């Protein structure tokens, strides 16, 4: 038997933006969404996981113990107890997370990294099945599990994540992230309030339509079309949220966006805003350093990002 296994996954950015969860426990997406996994050029933005045999079950986030009192992570660990018993000689395992270049705690990358560790121990499991269990940890786990550009189809009862383009399809593109210091609306507030909107039923249908449009663009590697659409999706999504009192795009964020509209006439860009106080700007690689070097970031900090692949495991120890 072994004693432990490590794994790694990368954080994600929504491309067709998710709002609404079917149930607080299983956390199935109410409608179809799409996303990309990202890191920096070195691959240093990441979540690293260690699952190991133990006398009692402990959950740690960057060294801080969690009472995991919802049994969010512990639910997943219990479901795959047979995997751990075979691999480690015991059903009792602990989980230790270290996040780098993202905030300490649970995330899409954290969830996917759990999946990669389990698959690492039992490689003939169906990752689409494992994904269903991972959503309890984070509803967009599939983006990070499979990597690249994905679509997660969903009718609110059954959800399925499909790989649409490899990270290699974006090698000519970069994303400059502008991080603003405004306190963010929790994702749970986003999910809870968006469904109150009278436009919500049409949004769910519009979401599914946009994902089909993305699958079509993929046929000819139309990366600009995909990101152009992501910006249109972003604008619809945040117009719906504002009408339910959730305002993600704050004053200095809107000022940056206005400038983006100006330089768009000079060279191509498209932007995305998800749930946090960040503005993500897609750009052609030849213009990435130029964008990154602009002077008036309106008090935002800058990171150079790129599209990367799915979660992966290390050999068990
Ligand atoms: C707010 C948001 O990040 C929620 C994902 O659960 C939107 C998205 O990325 O699809």
Swiss-Prot record:
Gene3D superfamilies: 3.30.230.10, GHMP kinase, C-terminal domain. It comes from the Archaea. Pathway: Isoprenoid biosynthesis; isopentenyl diphosphate biosynthesis via mevalonate pathway. Optimum temperature is 55 degrees Celsius. Optimum pH is 8.5. Its EC number is 2.7.1.185. The keyword Cell membrane does not apply. It holds the Pfam family M3K_C. Keywords: ATP-binding, Isoprene biosynthesis, Kinase, Lipid biosynthesis, Lipid metabolism, Nucleotide-binding, Transferase. Catalyzes the phosphorylation of mevalonate (MVA) to yield mevalonate-3-phosphate. Functions in an alternative mevalonate pathway, only present in extreme acidophiles of the Thermoplasmatales order, which passes through mevalonate 3-phosphate rather than mevalonate 5-phosphate. Belongs to the GHMP kinase family. Homodimer. This is Mevalonate 3-kinase.
């Amino acid at each position: 038997t072994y004693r432990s296994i490590g794994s790694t996954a990368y954080p994600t950015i929504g491309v067709v933006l998710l709002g609404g969860i079917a149930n607080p426990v299983t956390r199935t997406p109410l409608h179809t969404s799409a996303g990309i996994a990202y890191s920096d050029s070195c691959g240093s933005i990441r979540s690293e996981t260690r699952i190991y045999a133990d006398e009692a079950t402990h959950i740690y986030f960057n060294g801080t113990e969690s009472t995991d009192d919802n049994r969010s992570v512990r639910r997943v660990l219990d479901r795959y107890s047979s995997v751990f018993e075979e691999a480690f000689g015991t059903k009792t395992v602990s989980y230790s997370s270290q996040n780098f270049g993202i905030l300490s705690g649970s995330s899409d990358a954290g969830a996917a990294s759990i999946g990669a560790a389990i698959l690492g121990l039992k490689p003939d499991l169906d990752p689409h099945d494992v994904e269903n269990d991972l959503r309890a940890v984070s509803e967009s786990a599939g983006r990070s599990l499979f990597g690249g550009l994905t679509i997660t189809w969903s009718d609110g009862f059954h959800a399925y994540t499909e790989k649409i383009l490899d990270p290699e399809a974006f090698s000519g593109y970069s994303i400059v992230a502008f991080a603003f210091d405004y306190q963010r609306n929790p994702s749970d507030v986003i999910h809870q309030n968006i469904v109150r909107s009278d436009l919500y039923p049409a949004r769910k249908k519009h979401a599914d339509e946009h994902a089909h449009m993305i699958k079509e663009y993929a046929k000819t590697n139309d990366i600009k079309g995909i990101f152009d659409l992501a910006q249109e999706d972003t604008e619809e999504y945040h117009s719906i949220l504002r009408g339910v009192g959730v305002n993600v795009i704050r004053e200095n964020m809107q000022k940056l966006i206005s400038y983006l509209k100006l330089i768009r006439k000079d060279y191509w860009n498209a932007y995305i805003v998800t749930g946090g106080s960040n503005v993500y700007v897609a750009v052609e690689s030849e213009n990435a350093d130029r964008l990154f070097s602009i002077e008036n970031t309106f008090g935002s900090k800058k990171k150079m990002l790129r599209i990367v692949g799915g979660a992966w495991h290390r050999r068990p120890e």
